[PDB]
Design a binder for this molecule. Sequence first.
Ligand SMILES: Nc1ncnc2c1ncn2[C@@H]1O[C@H](COP(=O)(O)OP(=O)(O)OP(=O)(O)O)[C@@H](O)[C@H]1O
Ligand SMILES: Nc1ncnc2c1ncn2[C@@H]1O[C@H](COP(=O)(O)OP(=O)(O)O)[C@@H](O)[C@H]1O
Ligand SMILES: Nc1ncnc2c1ncn2[C@@H]1O[C@H](COP(=O)(O)OP(=O)(O)O)[C@@H](O)[C@H]1O
Ligand SMILES: [Mg+2]
Ligand SMILES: [Mg+2]
Lengths: 52, 52, 173, 511, 64, 458, 460
Amino acid sequence: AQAEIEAERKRAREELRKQVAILAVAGAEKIIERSVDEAANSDIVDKLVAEL
Amino acid sequence: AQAEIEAERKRAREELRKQVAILAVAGAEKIIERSVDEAANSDIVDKLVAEL
Amino acid sequence: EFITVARPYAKAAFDFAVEHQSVERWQDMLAFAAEVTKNEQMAELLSGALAPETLAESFIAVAGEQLDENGQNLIRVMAENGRLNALPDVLEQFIHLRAVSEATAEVDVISAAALSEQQLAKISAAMEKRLSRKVKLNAKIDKSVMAGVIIRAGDMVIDGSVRGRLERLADVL
Amino acid sequence: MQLNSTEISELIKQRIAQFNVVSEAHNEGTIVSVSDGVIRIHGLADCMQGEMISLPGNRYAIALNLERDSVGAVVMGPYADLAEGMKVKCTGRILEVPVGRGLLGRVVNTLGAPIDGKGPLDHDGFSAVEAIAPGVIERQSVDQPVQTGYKAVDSMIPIGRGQRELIIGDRQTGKTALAIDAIINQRDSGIKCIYVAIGQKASTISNVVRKLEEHGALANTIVVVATASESAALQYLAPYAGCAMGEYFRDRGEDALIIYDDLSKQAVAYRQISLLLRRPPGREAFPGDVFYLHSRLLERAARVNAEYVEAFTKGEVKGKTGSLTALPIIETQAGDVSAFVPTNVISITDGQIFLETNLFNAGIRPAVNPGISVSRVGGAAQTKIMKKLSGGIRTALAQYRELAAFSQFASDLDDATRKQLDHGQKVTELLKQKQYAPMSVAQQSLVLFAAERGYLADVELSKIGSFEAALLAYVDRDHAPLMQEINQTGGYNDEIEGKLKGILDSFKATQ
Amino acid sequence: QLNSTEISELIKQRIAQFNVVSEAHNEGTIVSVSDGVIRIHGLADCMQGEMISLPGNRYAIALN
Amino acid sequence: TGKIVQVIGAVVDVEFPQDAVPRVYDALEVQNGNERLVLEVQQQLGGGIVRTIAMGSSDGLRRGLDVKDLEHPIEVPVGKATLGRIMNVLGEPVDMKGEIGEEERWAIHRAAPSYEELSNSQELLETGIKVIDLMAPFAKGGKVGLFGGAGVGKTVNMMELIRNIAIEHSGYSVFAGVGERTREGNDFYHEMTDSNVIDKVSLVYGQMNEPPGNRLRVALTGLTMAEKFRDEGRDVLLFVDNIYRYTLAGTEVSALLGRMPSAVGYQPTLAEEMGVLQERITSTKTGSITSVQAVYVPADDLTDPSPATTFAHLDATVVLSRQIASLGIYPAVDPLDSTSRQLDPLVVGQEHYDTARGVQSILQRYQELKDIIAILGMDELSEEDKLVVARARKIQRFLSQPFFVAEVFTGSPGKYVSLKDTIRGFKGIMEGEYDHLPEQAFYMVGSIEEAVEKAKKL
Amino acid sequence: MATGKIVQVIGAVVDVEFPQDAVPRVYDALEVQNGNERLVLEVQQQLGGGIVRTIAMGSSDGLRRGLDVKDLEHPIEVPVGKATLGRIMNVLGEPVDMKGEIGEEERWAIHRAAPSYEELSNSQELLETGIKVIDLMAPFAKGGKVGLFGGAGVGKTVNMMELIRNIAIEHSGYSVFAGVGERTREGNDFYHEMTDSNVIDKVSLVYGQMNEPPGNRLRVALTGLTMAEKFRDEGRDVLLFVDNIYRYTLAGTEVSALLGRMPSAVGYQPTLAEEMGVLQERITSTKTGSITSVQAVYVPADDLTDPSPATTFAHLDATVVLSRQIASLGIYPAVDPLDSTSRQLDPLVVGQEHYDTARGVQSILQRYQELKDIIAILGMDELSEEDKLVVARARKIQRFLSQPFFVAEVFTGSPGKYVSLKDTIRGFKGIMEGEYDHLPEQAFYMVGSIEEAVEKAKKL
Ligand SMILES: Nc1ncnc2c1ncn2[C@@H]1O[C@H](COP(=O)(O)OP(=O)(O)OP(=O)(O)O)[C@@H](O)[C@H]1O
Ligand SMILES: Nc1ncnc2c1ncn2[C@@H]1O[C@H](COP(=O)(O)OP(=O)(O)O)[C@@H](O)[C@H]1O
Ligand SMILES: Nc1ncnc2c1ncn2[C@@H]1O[C@H](COP(=O)(O)OP(=O)(O)O)[C@@H](O)[C@H]1O
Ligand SMILES: [Mg+2]
Ligand SMILES: [Mg+2]
C-alpha cells in the first residue's frame, strides 16, 4: 500500500500545481479589496506552479 | 495492518496540504508586493479610518 | 529600574504643582534636575557612599534653575532615601500625569508612505472620538508594512497594515 | 483515490473565503526580561490573571502575576529565542483548550496542537483549562463498575464510574501496564478514555501509542503528551488540559476515563516553576500549595446527577448522569508511602493500589499489596455477584501477611494454619495474571467462588495456574450460557450459588 | 527596589516644608496595621521598651 | 471607590482614598465579569492601600477594576432557620432550595468567651467503641481530636461517632467540612436526608475544590452557627471534618501577604491562627459545645508543627496509625499514644482506670521486646515473656471492632459494645482466663462472649 | 565591530550591557579579549535594561569593567563529522592535542531540540555488542541508555574499548567519548591505552576535566552529543560514552548557585530534571540512525534515593554492575550477572527462549551462592548429590561468561572473539540442561562459543 500512496502522491502533486496559482491570487485579492490583473505578475504565478 | 495504512494516508495527505498552504501565502505576498500602487494604499487606509 | 519607586514622587510633585498653578515651571525644573543626573561627573558622585545631606547640598549647588524652596526640597527628600537616580523617571511620570489631567494624547501613526494631510485630519478626528483626549499625531514611515497604517495610542494599537493581514492569514491555515 | 487535490484545494479556498479582512483593536506590551522560562512584561494594562498572552512566533505565555507595574508570565514552549524589547499582545481569553469528540484517536500537545502528522483538529469549541469542580449538591454517588481486566483489582480494589483511584508504587513495577490495561479493556463498554503522559520519555510514549493502536483501543482514546524535554510549564499544565477534555464528556451525560501518567513529575515541574519565582518552599522543598495543585485537579473527576446534565446542556440531554474516572499514577522512592507528595495524593483520591516491588520481583504480578491498597467506595462499585464473592478477602490477606511474617519459624494448629496458609497463599498464587489478558466478570466470579468456598484446599500451589487454565475452558465448553448470563447482569441468586456448585463438582471430578 | 513608607501626601508635606516645623515629639500617627504590629510615623522621642498609648485604653511596646 | 492595583494568586491589593480606607476584616466587593467576588481585607498598608484575600476564583481580574467597600465584616445567617440546609462560606445557600429565611446575621469574627464564663463537666459520655472509651474516654462538653495520616480511618471513626452520639442526642448539631472531598459531603448529606435526621443538622462546606479564601474562612462560619446555638441555652454537637486544612490554607496565603516563613515553611502566626479558633469552641455556663475534630498529620510526622501545636487544645486525643491499619486492625487506634483528661480514678472509677493502665503496661512491655524478637527470634524469651507476647497480641486483636458504617467495606455487620462489657473482657484477657483461645478468635468481634464463640468455629 | 561592555564580574559570572535594541538572545555566545587571549561567554539570562548575564567558558581573572564585548550571533558552534575522529577537543571544539587544525567542513550549534515525536523510529530493536554477559543478561536497546555502575580496578575502560571496537568493526558505526569532569590522569592514560590498541582511529574525544571552570564542565557533555548527532545524520549507528553523568549534574548545581537561584530538594538546582532530560532526550533511535549511550554513574553516599541517582535512573534502560569479586576470580569481563539488569528482558521484546535462558542462569547462580555459603562452614561433604551437581554446573556457567576481547590481547595473548547472540543462547541452553556435563570446567574458561569449548576439551 505504501507504493500506491507514493503513486497517488506524485499524481496529486502534479495536480495541485494547477491550484496554487488560483489560491495565491484569491488570497492576494482577499487581503486587498482591489482586484488585480494577471499580466503584471505572470512570472510570479508561473514560478509558483513550478516550485511545488 | 489496515489501521497502519489509514494512518499513512492521513499523514501524507496532511503534508501535501501543508506545502500548498504555505505556497499560497508566499505567493500572495509576492503578488501583493508587486501589485500595490498609491491609489490602492489610499483605498485601504481610507476604508480602515471609516470603521476606526 | 525605577518605575515603581518614582510613582510616589511624581504624584506628590504633580499635586503640589497643581495647587500652585506652576505645573509648567515644575516640568522645566524636573527636566533640568533629570539632566544633571545624566552628567558623567555627577553620576559618579551619586553612586558614592556620601551622606544624604552632603549629596543633596552638593547636588543643589549644581542647579540654580530650581525655585529655591520647593524644587530644592524635592531634591532633599529624594536624597534622604537615596533615590536621586529616579529623577529621569519622575519626569516621565510627571509628564504622563499632566497629559491625563489636561486630557491630551499622543498617538503614533506608522505608514508605508506619508499621508495626504487630509487623511491625517480624518484619523485625528476619529481618534478624538476613540479617546476623550485632544490628540497630537506623530506619523512615521516604515517599509516592513507595505500598505495600510498602524495607529498606536498608548498601549492600544489599531492595526490595518497589509503586513499584519498577511501574517494573520498565514495562521488561519 | 482519497488524496484528491480538489478536496485539498477547496479546503484551503474555504478558509481564504472565510477570512475577516477587518482590523481589530488589541492591547500591547513589551518583554522586559527573560530567564529560565519566566517572562516579565511591561505594559498590558488590560491583562487579566490566567490569561493567554501571545508572543511572536506562534506561542503563548500564561499570566501568573499582575504586579503594580509588570506582568509575570511563563512561556509555553521553547523560550530561548525570545528577547527583551519584543512586543506581545493580550488576547481576551483565559487559558483555553480545544475540546470535542473529534479529538478521539489523536495525539495532542498540551495546548491542543496535534503532534501526530495527521493535520488540524476537528473540535467542538474551546474549554477553560482552569475550573472549579461541581459542588456538593451536583454530585451523585458512584454506583457503576469500571472493569479493568485484572482479578486482583476487580475483586479487592473495585473501581466505579466517578471514582478516583491512585496507582502508587516504585519504578518499574507495572504501573503503566495496569493503567493502559485498564484503558484497553474499556475498548468495548462505551467509556471514552484519555491518557496524559507528563515528563515521560518520548520513545516510551510512542511505544504506548503503538500498543494502544495494536489492540484497537486507540480509536477511543485521546493522548495528551508533554515529554521530558518540554518546558516545565507544559508539564505543569498538561493534566489540566486533559481534564478539560474529559469534562466535555462528563457534562454531556457520558462517561470518560482519564489517566495522569506521572503526577510526581507534575509536582516536580511545579516546584521548578515556583522556585524560579522565589517563593518560600516548605517540606521537601515543595511549595506551600502543592496540595492545592493536585486537589483542584482530581476534584474534577466526578459523577454528576441528571439535573446538572440538564442544566448544563440547556435541556438537550434528559435523564442521564455523566462521569469522569481518574487513575493518577504516583512514584515512590524505596517503597516509602509516607513521603510528602504520595501522602498528599493518598489524601485526595478515593483509594489506592499499592504495587510492591518485593511481590513484583518474586513474580507475583500485578504486585497488588493488600493491606496498603484500599477502595474507599468499596463494594458499592461492584456487581452484586463480585460483591458477594469477594467480601473481606483483602483484610484476609492483611491478616495472612502479618501472620506469615511472624510465623517465620514454626506454626500452631498446624492442620488449621496448614489449610489457612494453604488458601491464604493460594489466593496470592491465584490473583497473578498475565499482561494483556483481561478476563470478564463471569470468568473472575467463579474463580473467586472456587477460591473462597474452600475448593482449593485440595490442590498444591504449583497446580493453581493449571487448575484455572482448565476451569475457564471447562465452563466455556459445558456451562457456556451461564457465562453470557452473568456478563449481562449482576446475577446473584441462591439458584446461582447452587448452579455454581454444580459447576465446580462436574469439573473437579474430571480434570 | 521597594518603598519605605514614602507616600504621596507625606512627600507633598515635605515638598512644601523640608525642615518639619517643630511638632510634638510626644506623638505620632499609625501608618500600617497587620497581624498585631503597627508602624508608627513620628514619635521622635520614643524610647525602646516604652509604652505607647492608642485610642481606647490600649498600649503597645515600642520595639523597633 | 477603590481600584485594584495588584493580583498575586489569591491575594488582591486595592487602593482607596486616603480617608475612606476599610478596616481590617471588612468585606469588599468586585464584579469579576458576570460574577460578584467578595474580598476580605487582611492588612492596612501605607497610603490607602489595603491587602485582601479573594473569597472566590481569582482568575479574570484585571488591574484597575472598581471595588466597592461594604462597611461590615463577612456575616452569615444563624439560628434555627439555618437548620437542615447546606451553606457556603459566605452564608449563601448552596443546595438548590430557596433562600435561607434567617432573622439574624452574625459576624464570623468574634472574641472567645471570658475565663469567668467557662464551665467544667466530668459527665462521661459513652460511645460503643471499645478502644476509644477504654483508653481515652471523653465527656459531655469536651473536645476530642482524631490524629492520623492519610487513609488510616479518621473519617470512618467520625461517622461512627456521629452515629452513636448524634442520633441518640436531642439537641442540634453542626457539621463543618473544611477542605475535604465533596464526594463524602454528598454521601453524608444523603445519608442524613434518607433517614430524616437532616432537619436537626446544619451543614457548611468549603471542600477542597475551592480557592484558599473559602477553605481559610469556612471554619469560622461553622463555629458561628454553633455559637449561636450555644448562646440560646442549648447544647450542641460540632464536627469538623479536617481542621488541618484551616492552617494549610493559611500557609498558602502567608507568603503573599509578605510575611517571612518560619520553621518548615509555616506562617509565622501558626499558633495564634490556631488558638484564636480553638478558643471559641468551648462549653460555657449558658450552654455546651461537644466537638470532634479530625486532625490530619502530614507525612505521618507527629512532630510537625501543625499537629504538635494542636495537642494542647484537646482533652481527648485519639492517635491513629498506619502501622496498625496495615495489619487490618480497625479502628487503627494506637493505645500507647491515645489519652484523655478524663482517665482518672476519681472520674472513671478505680476498676476502669486500673484496667486501662494494665493494658498500656502490657502493650508497652511488648513494644520493648520487638527488637530482640526480631534479631534472635521468639525462642530466646523467658518463659513468662512468651506469655506477655501472647496476651499482648490477643489484646491487640480484641481492640478491633466492626463498625456499622464499615459494612460497605467488609460485609460483616456492625457491633455496639458497652463500657461495662469491655472492661470486663479486658480484665479477663489480662488475668489469663482466656489463654486457651487462639489469637484469631479475637479479631473483629463485639464483646468477649463473641470471641469465646468464634473460637468454636476456629 | 563590538557593541557590548562588561559591567560586573563576580567569580565566573559576567554581566555585560548592550544597546537596548541589540541584546543577545539566550545561549548566544560572546567574546572578549582577556588580556592577550579571547574568552567566550555564554548568555544565560536577560536582565532588564540591556544587561545580559553570562558565564565564562574560561577563567575570568584579568577581566576589567568596561571591556568591549563582541556579540557572536549564534550559540557555541563546534566542528563535526569525520574530521574529528581520533582528535581531542575541548568544550569549544578547539583541538587540544598538538596535531593542529581540525580539517572539518561543517560546524553545528550545540543547543538543539530533541527529535520530534514523528521522527522517532517506529520499532524496538536491540544492539548486539558481542559480549556474552552483556548480550545475555542485560541486552542493549538500539538507541537506549545504559548505566555502568562498576567501581575501580575492575576494567571499566577495557570494556569501553571493547565496545568502541566492536561497534566500529562488526556494525559500521563510530563513537564519541565525552569526559565530564573526571581526573586528567585517567584521560591521558586512556588516550594512550587506545592509541596502542588501534581503536583511536574510530573514536572522537572531547574532554572537560575537573581542573576546568564550571562553564566548561557543564556544556562539554553537549559537544560530544552534537558530534554524535552528526554521525547519526549520516545514517550510522553511534555509541556515546559519558564518563560521569553525576558530574554533569554537579556542574549544573554549581552554575545554578552562581546565578543565585533558590536551592531545591537536597541542595540540587531547581531545574534538575529538566537539565537532565534535555540531555538524555536527544539520544534516541531515529528513522535515519541512532545513538546508544553507555554512561558511568556514581551514587552519592551509596544512596539510590538521592535526587541525582533517582533522576538518572528514570532514563536508563539497562544497567551493568562490575564486581571486584568476579575479577578476583580472574574472570573477565567482571560483570555481575545477578545485579546487572535490563528492561529489555521480556518475552514480548526479546523472545521467550532468551528470557527463560537468562532467568535460568540467574537462578542457578543465586542458588550456587547459598550452596557455596554452606560449604565454607560445613564442608563440601554436607551437600546432597543434587547440590554437588548444581555446584558443578554453576561453576561451568560462571566460567562460560568469560571472553577474550580483541583489545585484551596485550594481556592474555589469546585472540579475541566476537560471539553472536544466537551462540550465547545455544551455549547456555546447553550448559544448563545437562548436556556438556561430560567435559571439564576449564574447557569453558575464556573460550568463546561452545563449539570451541568442545574443541578445547577435546585436547585439554
Ligand atoms: N502482569 C504482568 N505480568 C508480567 N509482567 C508484567 C506485568 N505487568 C507489567 N509487567 C512487566 O513489568 C515491566 C515494567 O512495567 P511498567 O513499565 O508498566 O512499569 P512502570 O511503573 O511503567 O515503570 P516506569 O515507572 O519506569 O514507567 C514491563 O516490562 C512489563 O513487561
Ligand atoms: N472499621 C473499619 N473497617 C474496615 N475498614 C475500615 C474501617 N475504618 C476505616 N477503614 C478503612 O479506612 C480507609 C480510609 O478511609 P478514611 O477513613 O476516609 O480515611 P481518611 O481518614 O483519610 O479520610 C477506608 O477506605 C476503609 O476501608
Ligand atoms: N578482558 C580482560 N582481559 C584480561 N585482563 C583484563 C580484562 N579486563 C580487565 N583485565 C585486567 O584488569 C585490569 C583493569 O585495568 P583498567 O582497565 O585500567 O581498569 P580501571 O580503568 O577500571 O582501573 C587490566 O589492566 C588487566 O590486568
Ligand atoms: Mg511508567
Ligand atoms: Mg476524610
